Symmetry: C3
Subunit: 325 residues, 3 copies
């Protein structure tokens, strides 16, 4: 019997299936109250948070413990999200991001961007199809992103008419980076996301499987390799067909999550973990009920009083007979 | 009897009356130790935090629970804080802010701002009367603030010599916004505050009335409409006259807050709430003291021991009689 | 016997000796699991974090309680870090930083920087010797840093060919500031760190002595003046020689920290403090075992049963004798 830590020192990191504040309840999988901090956004993921579609909805857990139930939306990242030469693979970017949300002491901070000329700051939907901040460079220049010693991941998207990275001609599209970069001969527009900083990694989580309506992309499928992974109800790896639609509201997922979050009388303060098996979880101590012991004392005192009375009467009775003797 | 959650998973969100580390005690209303995180700044409020007067003192709760005791300072926002055309009203901006502090998963982050030409970054007191970061545009241009899809509120203040929003001529002053905006033909200076982001809203709070020495402005008065609102001592709606001055140190408010924060032996870990009525609060389990039960056993044992020998003596006394009677000739 | 708060509402603020996720265990002094949030980074300090060496590793506690075990690395700040005219002294900068980490409601945020002309944003190792974000001004101008009313500390480093502060000629190097500044006639490059904001100061900490392999610099030695200071094992004030090297892994420091973090059955939820002496710490409540009290009742009930039998016989015997008389 799985018991998930349902407690104020825990952050639930989710997508629409957990976005209790903003999603029609029919599409929710998390339908029980979560006593911790809920960070869940319809459409979002640990990669998608860097796209610019949800500019105010970055995940920023600050608690010791986390429970993750997301990933399906990150499967909409594809070849064009790792097409800039020298970008990380999606497999590697996703592994670092899921490690950070699960275990990391994390921050979301502005990413350094600069250049040999002043770039024009604006916003446009021309680079990604939706509105994001960009720098526009009207002549070819050196463009720099990130700083030596950084520890985190940021996303870049370009619409360049010229440029190269270390002599390799750039390709328009996006990439993930966890090191500083330098573009030479760059002209055009550049989008740079904030940095998901991942520093120490001694926080703790459960990673609940997030299933899609088709088999998972490789970079999310690989979350199965993390010690914290826990399976959730699925049909051959695909989201069950017992929900509001093919992707939300699964009756069986709802039951799995509600049961695990409502284990009775667990003293979460006594275990350093984001979950435990019910028989092993520490239990709340209750007030001792002394009613039985008191009833026993009272009954004993009653009978001893009776004996006291009988003894004195037999003493008088013996005296009565000896007087007669 | 009201019990307020006094626990490390709670943030107290306040102004001078709770700013224990920086305000003379004669002016405090929170005069008892708060076991949670204290974020309280003299002169500040959820609107005023966006003004630029207190550039390092934004409210940034990150805990599940909150207790709010502020609002009086937000009544210094007025018509000139909602005068930029298309600005939110103060009623709606404050509603969104107080909801976010109370229930929100919130952040404070830099607000996007850009333009069709490069703006000059500086600081000045010419826009608001005190020093804030501004962009100066010396020729008319397109100015853009915020991004589609954003979820939060930011403040804008302008000192423009030309410009319009959607063809409506700009008016100098400030406004609050929770959507991106675009100014055309803009020349002059623009201040843009950071964004108070409000995302999910499943955190929990109590909202304690913050009274002024005059009747509350409408945008703070409407906080009474929120489920979390709790009245605090006041005289016809105004701060009581039993304090250090007309706005601070009320004896009766102090007693109200101290009493509510010192309920004995509440096990806050067992209730998912920022307050409870005392009789309904879960109580700490304490070690059982068995001394009285042990005393009762010992008292009983002493008397039973006496009985053993009393009985022994009656047995010998009877047997004497039996033996003596047996000798009666038939 | 010292007991340190080992609980999810506590942040451990450390350097390599506590950097469990990134440092070989042989160099750790914190070798036991910490149930709170661990923010510890090799080479770091509350001053060194602002140097530009740690762009993603600023300390950002958000918990009520903290335990600090750092300072040794801050002793490499020296005269060149307080050489810009009107800079704070290192003594005063460190005092404010350690008080803020210990007691503060703190944030790390971008520091305002502006000028009378547009500065060129780039990165360079020319100002500090390693790559950081800078503005370049190729003609003389007014440069402004920070804002009136700010509450925190930031670091500035310059490589200027001209400039003054209030008519005092600038000197190249660094300085710490907790107020806005204005440079006139400035030409060259300027690095400005993020601001370590310190607002209210009602959070609570223990400040564990951090020893170096030589006597502490003045600005860290003075942490002994804080109420929260607690000595850790040392030899004449110097790091003990019983470790992996002269700066890490002390057997006696390890035992000191492990012992203090493993006090049994402390109910930290009942004490508003980052530490307590063992005998005074509140202890976890355990279920009461009533077995001995029940055994006592049974022993009594047995004897009372016997007395009932003996009284009955006494009654029979007195009746018999009376029958005869
Ligand atoms: C680089 C650029 O000129 N972006 C413009 C942008 C773009 O032309 C469209 O493609 C939408 O992307 O549209 C706007 O109407 C907009 O509201 O976002 C104005 C933007 O102007 C500035 C200064 O950012
Ligand atoms: C836009 C502008 O030039 N602002 C200046 C500001 C201004 O004179 C107003 O406050 C008028 O009162 O004052 C300063 O002395 C100041 O210390 O903030 C320097 C500022 O210079 C720069 C480059 O930002
Ligand atoms: C101001 C400047 O020109 N900085 C350059 C920087 C610098 O030359 C020193 O680090 C070498 O001493 O080096 C680079 O190769 C680098 O990869 O960081 C590119 C930087 O370019 C820009 C526009 O920031
Ligand atoms: Mg495994
Ligand atoms: Mg109501
Ligand atoms: Mg008994």
């Amino acid at each position: 019997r799985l018991c998930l830590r349902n407690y104020p020192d825990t952050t639930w990191i989710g997508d629409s299936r957990s976005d209790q504040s903003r999603v029609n309840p029919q599409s929710l999988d998390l339908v029980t109250e979560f006593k911790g901090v809920l960070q869940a956004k319809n459409g979002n993921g640990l990669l998608k948070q860097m796209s610019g579609r949800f500019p105010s909805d970055w995940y920023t857990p600050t608690t010791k413990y986390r429970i993750l139930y997301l990933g399906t939306n990150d499967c909409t990242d594809g070849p064009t999200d790792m097409i800039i030469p020298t970008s990380m693979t999606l497999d590697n970017a996703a592994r670092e991001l899921y490690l950070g949300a699960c275990r990391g002491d994390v921050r979301v901070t502005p990413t350094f961007v600069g250049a040999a000329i002043v770039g024009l700051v604006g916003r446009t939907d021309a680079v990604t199809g939706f509105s994001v901040k960009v720098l526009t460079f009207s002549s070819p220049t050196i463009v720099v992103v990130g700083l030596n010693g950084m520890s985190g991941i940021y996303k870049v998207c370009i619409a360049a008419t010229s440029g190269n990275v270390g002599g390799v001609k750039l390709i328009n599209g996006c990439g993930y980076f966890n090191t500083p970069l330098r573009f030479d001969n760059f002209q055009g527009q550049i989008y740079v996301s904030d940095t998901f900083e991942v520093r120490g990694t001694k926080n703790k989580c459960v990673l609940l499987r997030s299933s899609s309506d088709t088999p998972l992309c490789s970079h999310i499928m690989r979350n199965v390799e993390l010690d914290e992974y826990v399976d959730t109800p699925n049909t051959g790896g695909v989201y069950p067909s017992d929900g509001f639609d093919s992707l939300h509201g699964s009756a069986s997922v709802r039951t799995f999550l509600t049961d695990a979050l409502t284990c009775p009388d667990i003293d979460w303060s006594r275990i350093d973990a984001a979950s435990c098996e019910y028989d092993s979880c520490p239990k709340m101590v209750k007030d001792f009920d002394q009613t039985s012991l008191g009833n026993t004392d009272t009954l004993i005192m009653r009978e001893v009083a009776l004996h006291k009375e009988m003894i004195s009467k037999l003493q008088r009775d013996i005296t009565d007979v000896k007087i007669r003797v």
